[PDB]
Write a protein that binds this ligand. Structure first.
Ligand SMILES: Cc1cc2nc3c(=O)[nH]c(=O)nc-3n(C[C@H](O)[C@H](O)[C@H](O)COP(=O)(O)OP(=O)(O)OC[C@H]3O[C@@H](n4cnc5c(N)ncnc54)[C@H](O)[C@@H]3O)c2cc1C
Ligand SMILES: Nc1nc2c(c(=O)[nH]1)N[C@H]1C(S)=C(S)[C@@H](COP(=O)(O)O)O[C@H]1N2
Ligand SMILES: Nc1nc2c(c(=O)[nH]1)N[C@H]1C(S)=C(S)[C@@H](COP(=O)(O)O)O[C@H]1N2
Ligand code: MOS
Ligand code: MOS
Ligand code: FES
Ligand code: FES
Lengths: 1288, 99, 50, 50
């Protein structure tokens, strides 16, 4: 019966007979047509769907504003509330909000897909704290991810709100007026001011949803429907119905019940309401901690510690305390702490009040200690700590926040007045089994003992077998988890054996001098500076100026249309895929009968239904699958919901096939084509060298993790089989080809149109086209527009990633570290299909900065039963150059020289020759290295790090510096050709287009800068809509770091042609407007339309001889990075990074510096935190701590300096600029080798010499286990083939 | 081109022009419509001369295109338009032309 | 450069789909822009002749 | 199968525009009352020359 009534952006919204399953994000986008709020991930991790929620408290008379992730909010929860999206706070056709203005004008948007989420997080925080500190702002953005910007420019935007040659004018940003903000809708105040007791009911065919608004009613509903979940935040129930096949016919979702949100400050402690958010609990406890003395606030400190890291701001503000406790997630950060602290739960039934203790049995879901099915959690009591009572909580995740714990803990000790005899002890752990578990038996055996090292050795033994994991444990990482268990035990020993020292100095011993640093942990502040140059040029010429991205403000306001933001076209269908669940198996059968009969389903296509158009230059699996994630079926339905429902009812029966090949080593057991480069004579050189060294390095893959998933709309016109394809891709011409081929049509019938892409980084080409081809086949077959958009989980599985690499090397060198001989082997892991291109660029760019006089280099791509890998930002360089740096730091080790001494003496001279016999001027390579050594103060900081490491046993620092020679160029002249089309209308305005695609790199911004210079008119007079095969035909891929270079030359070419035609008119009226010139040109029959064309940079390679001139120019750079590691937990912190870069003359230094930072952080992630976990069966793991993590704000180095070396003329390139964009990625390994250095310093001090090869990614697991100590030796281990592991 | 099809068959005639000038069947040529986005500043479709005038402009683009390709055509006179177009791309010859 | 006009075919015009057409398009586009909505205007025969 | 202008599919949330036309050949416009028209089902806006 009831009606749902809430507000969105100030406007009333009413739904009668609303479906309770409707989530807010699709509702905003589809029913309200507010497409600013974006889908990124659908689990609440990325923050792209961030909105503000406002609520009136009728008793306290206060409006509360909190951020939240719209993907997880069911609209039935919003009754009487006010939502605000990015569109609500301002727009270009009203007034822009300052948050929107500044994030854009500080260049805090690249692709722009993450920008609305960032804006709403910052907006919401400024609504709660009008005059904030940067701490609060960066805390608010803990939940918000970005794959393009590197966060620095978003941090700068935030700083302009904080009362504490640049790229932006801060002194012109309009001030935040806190009184002219959005008014809370008065109707909602009036509704709130009259507490209706009537409980609301919403139904559909599938689900009943009850919102009780009194406590009486809540208990009434909990009795009737005992098995119905009580939804508070939906951050536990929501994510598991989405991708764990769970469904609830009845939901109970209470409104603000006062008894559920109590905050009692008792004499013995405090009792906290079960319906308080985790964010509100963090605030209550922060205040209590400051208002009370610091031995009654022991529990409250451990809770604050873990709440600082728990998820981000949006999830904390949605998630309830009762939800957290009842969920009983094994990785829960708060439950293990509550477990140890004598906490009790206040239960309430229709039958009565009742109280149970929060213990292990409860956390294990033993029904004796559990809630009975008909009752609800009202509140929890957390008592004050007694004097001589101490509490500690630890955790380790993949990154420092917004990441689920691999292992965590809560631990308590009680001494009871004076003497160090332990009278009580509770030790609880998470991530070590199905639930949070307490080591009670170990704890019994330790009662009576003193606090000293005799008891540690035994305590460690007797927990390590009580809280054991089998080698085949879910979650993997067994030996790391084993270590963390006892390493946290050590840290607790230290910590509490110091508060004892503090409180009772004479009776207890002080800690060992090299141990103290183990206690305080690594927790950031974010500083940055930027040098670059900027007389002779006109002030109206925009070339060289840091012009804001043209869509920057549209990103900030959500007015930028990305592919899925396009409005629903009349009667469009949705397409979703059934993907393979086996890595190498026979397809015995497919049953579609159940799926085909379900609501909305129109058609389900297997490979039979594509017949002779199931492959191009195969799309759908025929009779075998060759990796997980391979396409098998295509389900076409009236909606996305119906499509996915029906897809999950398709039954495919398999039969596994041998061999199941997963690694590169397995793949070496017919004929693979070799590539080879040879310089000098390496076989002779291996006889005149002082020493020889063999080794190898594995390198992991990498997900593109563009924030916009794969997305397209295919629309048949209904005439002559014309299709229009709107798709997020980097290569429209290829989309046109594969769709036309699939439909058996000429290319003139199929047109591909692309306005913008929300990031691509190489991973929106081949696989995109397959999906478009299949999608277009369905569209054409049924005469319907068809939309296909992938969810994040499917996307990562179906699309590939970067190629994993194996490097083997034999290096002959001199005792001064110079490398005269080098034999080298590269192996890419290709996945199911071919990849050879990536090997070729690997080998050509392998040299990097160094002159190897004798070199044999050989590479092979290796097919496995994994998703087929694709090209990525860098194109083999980040892999290939890491092989050679690993080889250097090993040679450095064997010479007792720093790697940076070995690098500097193996570098190319000013003039020198590459392994492929191309001449190079490497002057700017030397300068880049000189200036980076000077700027960074490398030599002084080197002794500072050595000094530190001599004084600290459990925490080490490291420093590294790597150089960059990044060559640029494609295989042929034809691959570099580029075209444009320019119109001048009779009002003088200009429309330009070209074959390049805007993916967030600012190519369209740069082309208007070119047009503005060449025609001598303001950029406001030029306009560009998009890219289209209809306007500019035969365009090459938007790739190879040269999109702007090449399309810039073609745009310039059209402009000059146009200016030549007009020069008669211009000379005869030199003071006239473009409107006058255009008009008289028309009046004199002069054409105002012109194609522009650039033929391409000359380029070639004879791969037989290994010699050629493949590259047009070389980008030079260097980068220094400093880190501190925790040897007990494997954590690390990026302290500082320094980057110098030769860019020629930057066409736009804002955009070019944006690309350096973005690439650097992307490389930083590749080499440290980004990790793809596959099972022995080839299944990708995507849940719990197996979650893939891209770099967040907390990973961005505390200090960051970036210099652009002053220019020196490249007549061959566009305005002497050098195409950066992909370069910066390899510079991320400065962090890798800084960590490598830190680990070596721990291994030298402790005396473990010889072979240390650390592989990429350098994860916390790999760091910890490399810092061997008594705890690494102590842990129990397995035989290799005795168990089947969760991973590898 | 800038002409509008009102039922007088102007688009039919332009494909007839293209077919003669590039020496290819009309089945190989296609036209979607008219747009200020593709052809700017076009005059009214009126005065009994829409086909005459836009026909001369279509012919002009075709001839330009044929001049660029004549090297490729003389070197392979029995080749398809697919072959000529492909080798033109491979030799960095532009296949778009204003008339 | 912000406004583009696209025409596939006309079902006869004979001169009578120029000035008056443009006025109606101008008024129509003003409404569309004002309300952020696509707006369709099609005349019935009686109104059209008048 | 030939698409003429009104044959184009309905685009998401499009509105329709229709005109009130003059009923006199040469007259002064003393007044326009839109109050009844504006209150009726579906109506979004009514524009005069103002
Ligand atoms: C992106 C993301 C990141 C996260 N990161 C972390 C992290 O770093 N560390 C960590 O520990 N956790 C993390 N979590 C887990 C999160 O903290 C929990 O999901 C949350 O606390 C559950 O609260 P809720 O209100 O959303 O529970 P809901 O999803 O609303 O409910 C879950 C269960 O609780 C029941 N329930 C709720 N309230 C009551 C009550 N009063 N009485 C009886 N039953 C009740 C429901 O019936 C249901 O069965 C993360 C979650 C997400 C989505
Ligand atoms: N924001 C953003 N920057 C990006 C990309 C992207 O998808 N988004 N792609 C990268 C890749 S793979 C390439 S190959 C280059 C190509 O564009 P450019 O030649 O203009 O640098 O952009 C790089 N920078
Ligand atoms: N079917 C048809 N024929 C038509 C018209 C039309 O609208 N429909 N318009 C006429 C008018 S007014 C003119 S001015 C000419 C212009 O086109 P042409 O120059 O190609 O003859 O077409 C004439 N023939
Ligand atoms: O150069 Mo990477 O976009 S193919
Ligand atoms: O020539 Mo009549 O179409 S103006
Ligand atoms: S934040 Fe909801 S989409 Fe990831
Ligand atoms: S701009 Fe943040 S994701 Fe590309």
């Amino acid at each position: 019966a009831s009606e749902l009534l809430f507000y969105v952006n100030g406007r009333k919204v009413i739904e009668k007979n609303v479906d309770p399953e409707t989530m807010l994000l699709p509702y905003l986008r589809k029913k309200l047509r507010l497409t600013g709020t974006k889908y990124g991930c659908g689990g609440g991790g990325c923050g792209a769907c961030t909105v503000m929620i406002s609520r009136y408290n009728p008793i306290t008379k206060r409006i509360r504003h909190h951020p939240a992730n719209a993907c997880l909010i069911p609209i039935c929860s919003l009754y009487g509330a006010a939502v605000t999206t990015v569109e609500g706070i301002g727009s270009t056709h009203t007034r822009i909000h300052p948050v929107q203005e500044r994030i854009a004008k500080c260049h805090g948007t690249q692709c722009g897909f993450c920008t609305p989420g960032m804006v709403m997080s910052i907006y919401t925080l400024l609504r709660n704290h009008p005059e904030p500190t940067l701490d609060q702002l960066t805390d608010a953005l803990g939940g918000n991810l970005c794959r393009c910007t590197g966060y620095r420019p978003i941090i700068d935007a935030c700083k302009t709100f904080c009362k504490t040659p640049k790229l932006f004018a801060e002194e012109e940003f309009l001030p935040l007026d806190p009184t002219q903000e959005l008014i809370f809708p008065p109707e909602l105040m009036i509704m709130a001011e009259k507490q209706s007791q009537r409980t609301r009911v919403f139904g559909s065919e599938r689900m009943m949803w009850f919102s009780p608004v009194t406590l009486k009613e809540l208990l009434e509903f909990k009795f009737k429907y005992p098995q119905a979940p009580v939804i508070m935040g939906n951050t536990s129930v929501g994510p598991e119905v989405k991708f764990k096949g769970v469904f609830h016919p009845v939901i109970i979702s209470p409104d603000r019940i006062e008894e559920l949100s109590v905050v009692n400050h008792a004499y013995n402690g405090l009792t906290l309401g079960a319906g308080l958010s985790l964010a509100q609990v963090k605030d209550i406890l922060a205040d209590v901690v400051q208002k009370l003395p610091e031995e009654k606030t022991q529990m409250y400190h451990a809770l604050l510690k873990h709440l600082g890291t728990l998820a981000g701001s949006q999830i904390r503000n949605m998630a309830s305390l009762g939800g957290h406790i009842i969920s009983r997630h094994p990785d829960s950060d708060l439950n293990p702490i509550l477990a140890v602290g004598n906490c009790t739960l206040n239960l309430l039934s229709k039958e009565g009040k009742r109280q149970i203790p929060l213990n292990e049995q409860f956390l294990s879901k033993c029904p004796n200690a559990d809630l009975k099915p008909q009752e609800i959690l009202v509140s929890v009591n957390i008592p004050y700590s007694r004097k001589w009572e101490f509490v500690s909580a630890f955790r380790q995740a993949q990154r420092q926040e917004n990441a689920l714990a691999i292992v965590n803990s809560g631990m308590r000790v009680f001494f009871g007045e004076g003497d160090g005899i332990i009278r009580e002890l509770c030790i609880s752990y998470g991530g070590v089994g199905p639930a949070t578990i307490c080591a009670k038996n170990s704890c019994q055996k330790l009662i009576g003992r003193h606090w000293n090292e005799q008891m540690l050795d035994i305590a460690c033994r007797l927990i390590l077998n009580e809280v054991s994991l089998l080698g085949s444990a879910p979650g993997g990482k067994v030996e790391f988890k084993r270590t963390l268990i006892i390493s946290f035990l050590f840290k607790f020993y230290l910590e509490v054996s110091q508060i004892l020292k503090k409180m009772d100095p004479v009776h207890y011993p002080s800690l060992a001098d090299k141990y103290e640093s183990a206690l305080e942990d690594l927790h950031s502040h974010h500083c940055s500076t930027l040098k670059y140059q900027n007389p002779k040029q006109h002030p109206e010429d925009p070339i060289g100026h840091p012009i804001m991205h043209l869509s920057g403000v549209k990103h900030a306001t959500g007015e930028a249309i990305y592919c899925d933001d396009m409005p629903l076209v009349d009667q469009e269908l949705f397409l979703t895929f059934v993907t393979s669940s086996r890595a190498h198996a026979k397809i015995v059968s497919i049953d579609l009968s159940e799926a085909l009969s379900m609501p909305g389903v129109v058609d389900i296509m297997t490979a039979e239904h594509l017949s002779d158009v199931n492959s191009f230059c195969k799309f759908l699996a025929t009779d075998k699958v060759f990796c997980v994630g391979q396409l098998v079926c295509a389900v076409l339905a009236d909606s996305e919901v119906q499509a996915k429902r029906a897809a999950k009812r398709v039954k495919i029966v398999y039969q596994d096939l041998e061999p199941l090949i997963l690694t590169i080593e397995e793949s070496i057991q017919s004929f693979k084509p070799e590539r080879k480069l040879e310089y000098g004579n390496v076989d002779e050189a291996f006889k005149v060298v002082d020493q020889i060294l063999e080794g190898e390095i594995h390198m992991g893959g990498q997900e593109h993790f563009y924030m916009e998933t794969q997305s397209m709309l295919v629309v048949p016109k209904g005439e002559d089989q014309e299709m229009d394809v709107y798709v997020s891709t980097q290569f429209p011409k290829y989309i046109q080809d594969i769709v036309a081929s699939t439909l058996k049509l000429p290319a003139n019938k199929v047109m591909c149109h692309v306005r913008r892409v929300g990031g691509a980084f190489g991973g929106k080409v081949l696989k995109t086209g397959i999906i478009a081809a299949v999608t277009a086949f369905a569209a054409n077959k049924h005469g319907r527009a068809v939309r296909c958009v992938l969810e994040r989980g499917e996307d990562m599985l179906i699309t590939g990633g970067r190629h994993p690499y194996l490097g083997k090397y034999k290096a002959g060198f001199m005792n001064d570290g110079r490398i005269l001989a080098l034999d080298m082997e590269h192996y890419s892991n290709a996945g199911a299909s071919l990849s050879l291109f990536v090997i070729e660029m690997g080998l050509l760019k392998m040299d990097n900065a160094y002159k190897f006089p004798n070199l044999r280099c050989r590479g092979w791509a290796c097919r496995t039963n994994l998703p087929s890998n694709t090209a990525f930002r860098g194109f083999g360089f980040p892999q290939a150059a890491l092989i050679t740096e690993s080889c250097i730091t090993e040679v450095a080790a064997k010479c007792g020289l720093s790697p940076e001494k070995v690098r500097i003496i193996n570098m190319y001279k000013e003039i020198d020759q590459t392994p492929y016999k191309q001449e190079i001027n490497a002057k700017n390579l030397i300068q880049c290295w000189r200036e980076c050594m000077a700027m960074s103060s490398y030599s002084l900081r080197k002794v500072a790090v050595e000094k530190f490491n001599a004084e600290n046993y459990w925490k080490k620092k490291g420093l590294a510096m790597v150089p960059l020679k990044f060559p640029v160029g494609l295989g042929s002249r034809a691959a570099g050709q580029a075209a444009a089309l320019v119109h001048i209308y009779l009002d003088g305005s200009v429309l330009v287009t070209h074959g390049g695609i805007e993916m967030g790199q600012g190519v369209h911004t740069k082309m208007i800068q070119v047009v503005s210079r060449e025609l001598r008119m303001p950029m406001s007079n030029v306009h560009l809509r998009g890219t289209s095969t209809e306007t500019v035909p035969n365009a090459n891929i938007s790739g190879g770091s040269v999109v702007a270079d090449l399309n810039g030359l073609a745009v310039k070419d059209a402009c000059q042609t146009l200016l030549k035609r007009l020069e008669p008119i211009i000379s005869k009226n030199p003071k006239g407007t473009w409107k006058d010139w255009a008009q008289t040109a028309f009046d004199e029959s002069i054409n105002l339309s012109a194609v522009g064309y650039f033929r391409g940079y000359e380029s070639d390679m004879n791969w037989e001889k290994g010699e050629g001139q493949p590259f047009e120019y070389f980008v030079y750079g260097a980068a220094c990075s400093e880190v501190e590691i925790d040897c007990l937990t494997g954590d690390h912190k990026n302290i500082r990074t320094d980057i110098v870069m030769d860019v020629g003359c930057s066409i736009n230094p804002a955009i070019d510096i944006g690309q350096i930072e973005g690439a650097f952080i992307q490389g930083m992630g590749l080499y440290t935190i980004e990790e793809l976990n596959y099972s022995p069966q080839g299944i990708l793991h995507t849940r719990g701590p197996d979650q893939y993590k891209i770099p967040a704000i907390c990973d961005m180095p505390t200090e960051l300096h970036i210099a652009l070396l002053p220019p020196s003329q490249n007549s061959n390139t566009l305005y002497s600029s050098k195409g950066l964009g992909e370069l910066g990625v390899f510079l991320g390994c400065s962090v890798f080798f800084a960590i490598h250095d830190a680990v070596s310093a721990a291994r030298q001090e402790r005396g473990l010499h010889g072979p240390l090869t650390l592989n990429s990614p350098l994860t916390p697991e790999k760091i910890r286990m490399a810092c061997e100590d008594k705890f690494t030796k102590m842990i129990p281990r397995d035989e290799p083939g005795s168990y089947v592991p969760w991973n590898v």
